[PDB]
Design a protein around this ligand. Structure first.
Ligand code: CDL
Ligand code: PLX
Ligand code: PEE
Ligand code: PEE
Ligand code: 8Q1
Lengths: 88, 175, 104, 459, 67, 62, 111, 128, 220, 124, 178
């Protein structure tokens, strides 16, 4: 039929996967609760690039006003779940 | 069929070619024609036969109404209301008859153009002349009367036309 | 209404309005099913100039081509029976002047 | 034809003697029966009219108008009983009495043999309409609307009366048959010019003509639903019927007195079609639509050709049905949301799909979709005008465009888009409303099937 | 026919679709080649185009610049 | 149940249309008009039996 | 009686049957798209026959079957022209429509 | 450096290209804060009634009523006969009528004059 | 009519070669073909115009179905900038679209050849406007141009769609419909042209260079 | 194409005009010319109902091709020889038209040059 | 869409939005992935070249010049995601969204089907009815006397409170309702 029912576990897996392919982030040092600003030592432009990578991964655009606030992979997973009405 | 007069609605004598096969292949048109005949034309014919048999057991007739001729608007006094009423009714009936005549001629023209095919411009010349003549007569009779037309207005138009043609004839005579 | 921010949670998402704010006098003209005033990548009166120039050039060139036609180096088509006099309208009681075509 | 007149005067005491909870049922049933009885009048001759007696006669032009009136009365009864639930019994009986009197007045008006009796009934129709508008309307504007409805008519109709009696002092009679048979040309004098104006201006106001139309939006917006139905469907057609009757004695003056009226009609057709594009009120859009269609009918009657007369009759009938249906459709939404603003309730197709279908059919019929009798009338008038002058097809063409636009605009503004979030009192459509729209629409297509019944005597 | 998503790998392909695609491409090319072999005139033209410069005056009947 | 579709959707409408054209539309003149068939040299007419002569001894530019 | 006219009218008339069945207990099920596609394919196969007749002979007809109304001298009737253009475009349009409907049975499944 | 973009009535100036936004002052910030506060107050007032369980019907919008009343019933009281108003009214209400009258009168006079001379080719012109 | 057709076909072909929505490109191709049809009417060849209508129906409808198959495959995505290497992922769709583009461009002995080739040869040998002839030639070059654009951006190169691969065309309905329209777009030209009577006078004598004009401009 | 460039850039006085052509008598340069003949009578061409534009001097081959096509209906690939013959007759007609155009061009240029030479001689 | 807007945008926010728009339009211009990566690295270098300017006047001047350059060199037909405000599926499914209160008008025969669903609906309605007054009282206490100054809303703080004005946000129809 159409696309399978995207689940929270799949969203977290994809977010972590795309994050672990970024050269400026160590794979092992990354956790689902890692902060991009404090823990990771990235600047604002790196956050913008990560947000665009998320959009390209999931095929939909995140508005800027909602995009600036996201700072950890858990926030990204929650935002994608709420936008897509994923409950399981 | 005999439903309509074949003189009012004339037709050519319907010449058609005989079929001359030239290939050993079968003609699917003939096979489909046979299938259509055997599957459609026979049950339809039987139903029609039954319906006509039922109709024949109860035969009654309707008649065409005949109207006599009454004095025209010319033979009517200025205020004789009854004679004017009768003349006006007669005029309206004649107007309807003339309209139907023009319609018949138009039907002749339309049928002929289609029937002729690619030679209609030459073949249909006879129909075209008849339509032109009847159209000219109809236009001289009833055109430009407008709404609220009557026998008096048609009479006035005719009188004006005859006055004009009499003047033209008298002026041409002196030439 | 097209120029308004599409990512804001408007009270009326379709009309892009909020409850209580003043309504433009010509709102029904600007309902975004209608006249749009949003900025364009190419400025006005530059699109106008290009479009008018294209249309005027095409019209003038078509006129020129009409006055300077293209054709093959051939004579006119020849038809056997007096240019098919009887075929294009008949009139068989007029004795039309004979048209004759010769070999070449 | 007292077989139609007397049953209505019997509807009067039957309504005034019925039980408190059976007024609507009895009135609707017997008005439907009277409409069925009146259906027999469509059997018209090809030469003359049905001359029943010295006082009443029926022609092929007035018979469809009588049938439409008798068909409209039960529809008005069905549309009125929703908003009249809280009224007292006596006031409901008075409302039904006013509607019955209006129908009786119209029935005698469309069949009077003399011009004076026709004038008397044509002016008597004012009182029930004024009472209804000024008493059962909703807002405070109704009073002003009533005044605009009344004097606009009388200032145009009072001179006509004088003209009428003057004619009887000259010709000796005002019977339509004697008038038609003893017609004489009108000379070229100032006296004859002013007689022409006196005979024409009343019906010009009743259509209404552009520039004389300012009473119509007020009257048709501020009146109750049955008032709006009867004003748009039948009362506008009195002017057209009267002009058709009276133009028999005005020739050949009309040949040059029709110019300013023709120019006003065409340009005002364009102007009102343009006004309909920018309207914040849903009822005013339908009112200005009515003005445009009546301008078309005015042009048709003025050019005075058999094709134009046929198109005028067809367009009159079709517009009556169409405008009544559109008014009912708007009234349903008004009863749901208690506001006439068009952009207030949007996306109604999601919540009311069958009502969306009714809206679609009404709008398609409004823009003259073939082969509806709307298009038949419009196209006949267009061809007659083209014969009158080849340039007319420009203006008519513009209208033929603009109309469609605003029609679809209305539809897309109300049925499409997304629903208004804060409006949550939109209940499913009742059977009464669906039956009302169905009874409005089915006769339109049925008459499309047999279009010779509404093409007038010139057919 | 059940095919699952792949996530950055080549999609799963069934033999039927490749067979159909190859057959139809081959039949298009066969038809083109066959028709070109048997109906070449429709591409290269059928009759030679004559050169008016190589027509003598005897057949064109133009007088030799005297009369 | 298997091929009832071809009966209730093809056979019945064609029966009704054949009836209506054969006995009602044809009953009035000029309702069904067909263009005349093409006649070529070497043909024989079905009704009259007349044969059409050949074509004027071709030049035979072989 | 010259099956050209009957087949040409039947091709047009059988396309309207699902429109009348739209208020029946087939519009409320999930078999309606298949029913419509089958109807259009049957119509195409029926229309393939008058094309063959024209190709063999060259038959052209006009059928003025219903007389709608008549003006003073202009008569309006329901007439169909079944010349070369009609009998050639109808099968092609029906074929394309059949293919498009079968494609839509897959494209618009989630609608 | 690059070609300039000049806005029009039907193609306005982009927000990022507006000079008046790149030169800001504290009073501009105060104005923006006041605008946001007004908008937030209106939004809260709307949302209180929007989420009310006991609310059944349509929340009246005074803005819509004001717009409709201004567009319809407030026009005549605020009308004054001025040279501009009088000139526009006379032009747009009289000029089209006389223009079309001249056009149609000229067309019909030419047609009638041709008719009198007997050269209009009215053959087959039965219906009118 | 001829001038209107020429301007329409040229303008639409010129607008098509830069579009990024595949549906918009096919729409502009349809408009250009309609302009060519109007040009054919303008030179007194209505039967050729009808034949072109019948010919173009097939491959235009099948091209739109192929585009729709691609769109439904990649989660309702219509931009060609985000459709990558589908030559091997969608073999049947690729085959069908290649055949349809070849037929549209007047490839010899296919469906679109038997109408468009005759149209070009008929406008070449007519007493006609020279500007219209030039615009018809430029438009028939731009036709091949935009077909090349579609094929190159949609079916060649590396993938550019989102990584969650949902490509699947193994459905009997889609395959059957496209196969029917494909058989049509391969053979209908020959079948119809050989089975209709000659309603036109043919152009038998033509210069060799003018005969290959359409082929030359298409290849360029 | 070259004739177009010759007429539209060079001397158009000696170039033929397709609308006004021929401007010379048909028997001017020729001593005797055979009247072009027809093989199909008007009646046969009418019964065949070819077209008004197909009734040229090559109508007989078209008539035979149409007759064979009607006779050989189910085999739509058997009408090749007569189609070739009709194509050949049309090609001959086109060649004759080209010959007429060349004749007119040569006659026009020769006549104009000869008149110019006569005027120059008389002016000396 | 979910977050309340502020009174104004900061300079850093403007620069970040310009960066995102420039990268997206450059990707629109550079179709292929490797080319996009190359010129994206170049654009990032251009952006972080002036990252350390202490003069805000010159920073705003550079932002102005960059905006002008972007407007001149923008793609006339940029790539838009299918469900973005300019996309080909932006408001596609808005016609399939029906508010929940419509279920209140269902016939009893219709509600006879799905009994458990309507039992849960009754539970949710009771929850809303009990929580309304507490939400109203919380809104009044938190808000400053001079009216609210932002569109933000406070969360729940007490034992069993709910965030005020939650019903219409929580009971959204769906993103793919039908
Ligand atoms: C050729 C057709 C043959 C049909 C044979 C049967 C004819 C029966 C006619 C009966 C009267 C029509 C019904 C009127 C009320 C509507 C019924 C209804 O409530 O439906 C809900 C019901 C239940 O659906 P639901 O699930 O509740 O749907 C919810 C929503 O409402 C969603 O519903 P929806 O979205 O499905 O909407 C319903 C649908 C349909 O609903 C309608 O719109 C009905 C009215 C159509 C528009 C009419 C206004 C424009 C002028 C047309 C005048 C035609 C008059 C013909 C004579 C009629 C005499 C009765 O809307 C449309 O499809 C748009 C219609 C556009 C028509 C375009 C063609 C225009 C005319 C073309 C020429 C016509 C003459 C052909 C012959 C010419 C010579 C060859 O569905 C149906 O009843 C069946 C719908 C069938 C649609 C047919 C539309 C075409 C009809 C045209 C006239 C037919 C003439 C018949 C005589 C022979 C000719
Ligand atoms: C908001 C819209 C309201 C409705 C409008 C109703 C339209 C009514 C207009 C009446 C139509 C014409 C009236 C008279 C017919 C001719 C008018 C005049 O222009 O024609 C010339 C008239 O010449 C001059 O105009 C003299 C008349 C001048 C006095 C009339 C006043 C004109 C000023 C405009 C006032 C606006 C009137 C409406 C007020 C509301 C012809 O010259 P002449 O051949 O000798 O007269 C013919 C009559 N004969 C044969 C008996 C001799
Ligand atoms: C013959 C008399 C009339 C001739 C026409 C003259 C011009 C008519 C002008 C009509 C004005 C109508 C105003 C209200 C219409 C409704 C509002 C409306 O349509 O909105 C505009 C809407 C939105 O624009 P989009 O680009 O789709 O944006 C969507 C993405 N955001 O688009 C439109 O519909 C605009 C249509 C107006 C076209 C007017 C210009 C056409 C001129 C054609 C003249 C050429 C004649 C051709 C001759 C052919 C040779 C014989
Ligand atoms: C249902 C299926 C019924 C199965 C049994 C039927 C078997 C045969 C029935 C034959 C009935 C007798 C009959 O049809 O005779 C013709 C009879 C009388 O002749 P008229 O032409 O009407 O008289 C002139 C005045 N109009 O005509 C009829 O009554 C049948 C009419 C039906 C025609 C088909 C449908 C056409 C109408 C559809 C709507 C058209 C709207 C307007 C179209 C305008 C076109 C210009
Ligand atoms: C495809 C066509 C369009 C391309 C045209 C566009 C090209 C424009 C290129 C030039 C743009 C610039 O350099 S504009 C450079 C502007 N200069 C400054 O901002 C200096 C002060 N520094 C800061 O504001 C922050 O450190 C900040 C830099 C935001 C980092 O933010 P974070 O670290 O906290 O995330």
């Amino acid at each position: 039929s159409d696309a399978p029912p995207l689940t929270l576990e799949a969203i977290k897996d994809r977010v972590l996967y795309v994050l672990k392919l970024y050269d400026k982030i160590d794979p092992e040092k990354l956790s689902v609760n890692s902060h991009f600003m404090k823990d990771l030592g990235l600047d604002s432009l790196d956050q913008v690039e990560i947000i665009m990578a998320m959009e390209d991964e999931f095929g939909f655009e995140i508005p800027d006003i909602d995009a600036e606030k996201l700072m950890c992979p858990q926030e990204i997973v929650d935002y994608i779940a709420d936008k897509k009405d994923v409950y399981e | 069929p005999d439903s309509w007069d074949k003189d009012v609605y004339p037709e050519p004598p319907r010449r058609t070619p005989a079929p001359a096969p030239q290939t050993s292949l079968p003609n699917p048109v003939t096979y489909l024609t046979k299938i259509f005949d055997l599957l459609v034309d026979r049950p339809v014919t039987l139903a029609r036969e039954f319906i006509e048999q039922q109709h024949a057991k109860n035969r009654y007739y309707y008649y065409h109404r005949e109207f006599r001729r009454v004095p025209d608007i010319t033979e009517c006094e200025e205020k004789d209301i009854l004679c004017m009423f009768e003349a006006e009714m007669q005029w309206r009936r004649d107007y309807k008859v003339d309209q139907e005549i023009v319609n018949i001629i138009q039907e002749r023209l339309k049928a002929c153009q289609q029937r002729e095919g690619e030679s209609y411009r030459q073949n249909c010349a006879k129909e075209l002349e008849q339509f032109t003549q009847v159209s000219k007569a109809f236009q001289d009779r009833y055109s430009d009367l407008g709404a609220h037309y009557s026998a008096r207005k048609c009479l006035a138009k005719q009188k004006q036309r005859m006055l004009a043609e009499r003047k033209a004839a008298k002026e041409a005579a002196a030439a | 209404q097209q120029e308004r921010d599409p990512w804001y949670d408007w009270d009326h998402p379709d009309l892009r309005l909020n409850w209580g704010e003043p309504i433009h006098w010509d709102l029904d003209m600007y309902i975004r099913n209608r006249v749009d005033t949003s900025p364009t990548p190419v400025s006005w009166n530059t699109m106008c100039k290009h479009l008018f120039g294209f249309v005027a050039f095409m019209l003038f060139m078509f006129w020129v081509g009409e006055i300077y036609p293209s054709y093959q180096p051939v004579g006119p088509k020849q038809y056997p029976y007096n240019d098919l006099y009887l075929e294009r309208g008949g009139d068989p009681t007029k004795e039309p002047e004979p048209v004759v075509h010769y070999e070449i | 034809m007292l077989k139609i007149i007397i049953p209505t005067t019997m509807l009067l005491p039957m309504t005034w003697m019925s039980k408190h909870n059976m007024i609507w049922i009895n009135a609707t049933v017997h008005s439907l029966l009277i409409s069925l009885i009146s259906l027999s009048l469509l059997n018209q001759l090809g030469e003359n009219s049905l001359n029943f007696s010295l006082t009443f006669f029926s022609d092929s032009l007035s018979a469809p108008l009588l049938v439409l009136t008798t068909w409209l009365l039960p529809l008005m009864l069905m549309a009125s009983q929703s908003h009249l639930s809280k009224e007292t019994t006596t006031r409901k009986k008075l409302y039904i009495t006013m509607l019955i009197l209006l129908q009786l007045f119209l029935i005698m008006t469309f069949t009077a043999t003399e011009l004076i009796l026709f004038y008397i009934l044509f002016e008597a129709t004012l009182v029930p309409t004024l009472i209804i508008i000024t008493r059962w309307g909703n807002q405070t504007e109704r009073l002003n609307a009533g005044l605009y409805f009344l004097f606009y008519t009388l200032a145009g109709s009072l001179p006509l009366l004088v003209a009428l009696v003057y004619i009887q002092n000259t010709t000796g009679s005002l019977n339509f048959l004697i008038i038609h048979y003893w017609s004489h040309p009108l000379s070229n004098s100032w006296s004859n010019i002013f007689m022409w104006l006196a005979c024409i201006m009343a019906f010009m106001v009743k259509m209404p003509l552009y520039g004389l139309h300012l009473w119509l939006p007020k009257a048709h917006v501020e009146a109750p639903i049955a008032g709006s139905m009867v004003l748009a469907a039948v009362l506008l057609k009195l002017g057209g019927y009267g002009m058709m009757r009276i133009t028999t004695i005005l020739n050949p003056l009309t040949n040059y007195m029709a110019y300013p009226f023709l120019m006003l009609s065409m340009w005002g057709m364009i102007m009102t079609s343009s006004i309909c594009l920018r309207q914040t009120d849903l009822k005013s859009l339908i009112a200005y639509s009515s003005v445009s269609h009546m301008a078309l009918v005015i042009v048709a009657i003025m050019i005075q050709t058999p094709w134009s007369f046929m198109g005028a009759t067809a367009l009159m009938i079709a517009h009556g049905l169409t405008s009544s249906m559109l008014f009912c459709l708007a009234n349903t939404n008004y009863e749901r949301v208690h506001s006439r603003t068009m952009i207030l309730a949007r996306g109604l197709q999601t919540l009311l799909p069958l009502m969306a279908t009714w809206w679609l059919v009404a709008s398609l019929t409004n823009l003259a979709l073939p082969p509806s009798i709307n298009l038949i009338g419009e196209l006949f008038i267009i061809t007659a005008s083209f014969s009158w002058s080849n340039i007319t097809i420009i203006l008519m063409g513009m209208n033929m465009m603009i109309t469609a636009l605003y029609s679809l605009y209305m539809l897309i503004t109300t049925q499409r888009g997304k629903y208004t979030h804060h409006i949550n009192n939109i209940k499913p459509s009742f059977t009464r409303e669906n039956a009302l729209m169905a009874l409005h629409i089915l006769p339109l297509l049925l008459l499309t099937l047999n279009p010779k019944m509404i093409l007038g005597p010139l057919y | 026919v059940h095919i699952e998503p792949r996530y950055r790998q080549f999609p799963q392909l069934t033999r039927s679709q490749l067979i159909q695609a190859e057959f139809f491409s081959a039949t298009m090319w066969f038809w083109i080649l066959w028709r070109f072999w048997h109906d070449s005139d429709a591409v290269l033209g059928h009759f030679p185009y004559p050169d008016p410069s190589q027509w003598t005056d005897e057949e064109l009947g133009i007088l030799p610049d005297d009369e | 149940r298997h091929s009832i579709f071809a009966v209730t959707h093809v056979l019945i409408p064609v029966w009704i249309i054949h009836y209506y054209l054969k006995y009602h539309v044809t009953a009035k003149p000029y309702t069904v008009v067909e263009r005349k068939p093409r006649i070529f040299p070497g043909d024989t007419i079905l009704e009259t039996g007349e044969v059409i002569p050949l074509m004027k001894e071709f030049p035979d530019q072989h | 009686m010259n099956p050209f006219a009957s087949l040409t009218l039947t091709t047009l008339t059988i396309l309207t049957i699902p429109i009348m069945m739209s208020n029946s207990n087939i519009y409320k099920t999930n078999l309606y798209p298949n029913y419509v596609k089958t109807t259009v394919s049957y119509a195409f196969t029926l229309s393939l026959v008058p094309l063959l007749m024209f190709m063999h002979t060259g038959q052209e007809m006009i059928i003025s079957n219903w007389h709608w109304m008549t003006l003073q001298t202009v008569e309006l009737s329901l007439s169909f022209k079944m010349d070369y253009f009609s009998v050639m475009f109808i099968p092609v349009a029906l074929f394309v429509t059949w293919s498009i409907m079968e494609f839509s049975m897959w494209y618009m499944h989630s609608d | 450096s690059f070609p300039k973009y000049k806005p029009s009535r039907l193609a306005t100036l982009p927000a990022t290209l507006d000079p008046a936004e790149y030169d800001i002052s504290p009073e501009t910030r105060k104005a923006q804060a006041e605008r946001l506060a007004i908008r937030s107050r209106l939004k809260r007032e709307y949302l209180l009634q929007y989420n009310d369980p006991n609310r059944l019907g349509v929340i009246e919008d005074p803005a819509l009523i004001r717009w409709t009343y201004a567009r319809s019933a407030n026009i005549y009281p605020n009308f004054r006969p001025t040279p501009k108003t009088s000139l526009l009214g006379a032009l747009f209400g009289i000029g089209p009528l006389f223009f079309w009258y001249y056009v149609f009168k000229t067309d019909r006079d030419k047609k009638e004059k041709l008719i009198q001379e007997g050269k209009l080719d009215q053959t087959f012109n039965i219906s009118y | 009519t001829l001038c209107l057709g020429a301007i329409t076909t040229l303008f639409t072909a010129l607008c098509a070669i830069t579009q990024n929505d595949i549906k918009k490109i096919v729409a502009f191709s349809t408009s250009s073909q309609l302009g060519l049809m109007m040009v054919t009417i303008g030179i007194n060849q209505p039967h050729l115009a009808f034949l072109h209508i019948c010919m173009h129906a097939f491959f235009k409808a099948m091209l739109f179905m192929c585009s729709g198959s691609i769109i439904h495959s990649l989660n309702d995505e219509q931009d060609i900038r985000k459709m990558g290497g589908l030559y091997k992922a969608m073999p049947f769709t690729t085959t069908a679209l290649i055949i349809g583009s070849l037929a549209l461009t007047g490839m010899p002995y296919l469906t679109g050849f038997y109408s468009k080739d005759l149209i070009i040869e008929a406008v070449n040998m007519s007493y006609t406007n020279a500007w219209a002839l030039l615009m018809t030639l430029i438009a028939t070059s731009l036709t091949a141009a935009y077909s090349t654009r579609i094929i190159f951006f949609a079916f060649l190169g590396k993938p550019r769609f989102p990584p969650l691969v949902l490509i699947n065309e193994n459905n009997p309905l889609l395959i059957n419909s496209i196969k029917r329209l494909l058989i049509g777009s391969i053979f209908a030209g020959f079948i119809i042209s050989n089975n209709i009577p000659p309603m036109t006078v043919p152009n038998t004598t033509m210069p060799l260079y003018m005969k290959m004009t359409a082929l030359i401009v298409t290849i360029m | 194409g070259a004739h177009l460039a010759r007429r539209y850039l060079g001397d158009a006085s000696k170039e033929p005009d397709p609308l006004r052509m021929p401007t010379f008598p048909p028997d001017y340069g020729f001593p005797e010319r055979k009247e072009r003949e027809m093989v199909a009578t008007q009646q046969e061409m009418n019964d065949a109902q070819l077209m008004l534009q197909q009734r040229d001097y090559c109508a007989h081959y078209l008539i035979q091709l149409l007759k064979c096509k009607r006779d050989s209906f189910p085999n739509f690939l058997a009408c090749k020889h007569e189609q070739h013959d009709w194509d050949y007759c049309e090609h001959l007609d086109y060649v004759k038209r080209m010959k007429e155009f060349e004749r007119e061009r040569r006659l026009l240029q020769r006549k104009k040059r000869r008149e110019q030479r006569e005027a120059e001689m008389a002016r000396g | 869409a979910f977050s309340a807007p502020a009174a104004y945008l900061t300079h850093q926010q403007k620069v970040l939005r310009l960066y995102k728009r420039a990268l997206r339009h450059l990707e629109s211009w550079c179709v292929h992935r490797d080319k996009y990566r190359y010129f994206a690295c170049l654009m990032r270098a251009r952006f972080d070249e002036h990252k350390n300017e202490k003069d805000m006047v010159k920073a705003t001047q550079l932002l102005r010049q960059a905006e002008e350059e972007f407007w001149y060199g923008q793609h006339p037909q940029p790539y838009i995601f299918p469900e973005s405000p300019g996309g080909t599926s932006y408001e596609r499914y808005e016609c399939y969204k029906v508010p929940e209160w419509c279920l209140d008008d269902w016939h009893p025969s219709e509600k006879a089907m799905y009994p458990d669903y309507f039992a849960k609906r009754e539970q949710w309605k009771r929850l809303r009815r009990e929580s309304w007054e507490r939400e109203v009282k919380q809104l009044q206490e938190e808000t400053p006397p001079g009216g609210p100054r932002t569109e933000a809303l406070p969360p729940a703080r007490k034992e069993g409170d709910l965030p005020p004005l939650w019903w219409h946000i929580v009971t959204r129809p769906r993103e793919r309702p039908m």
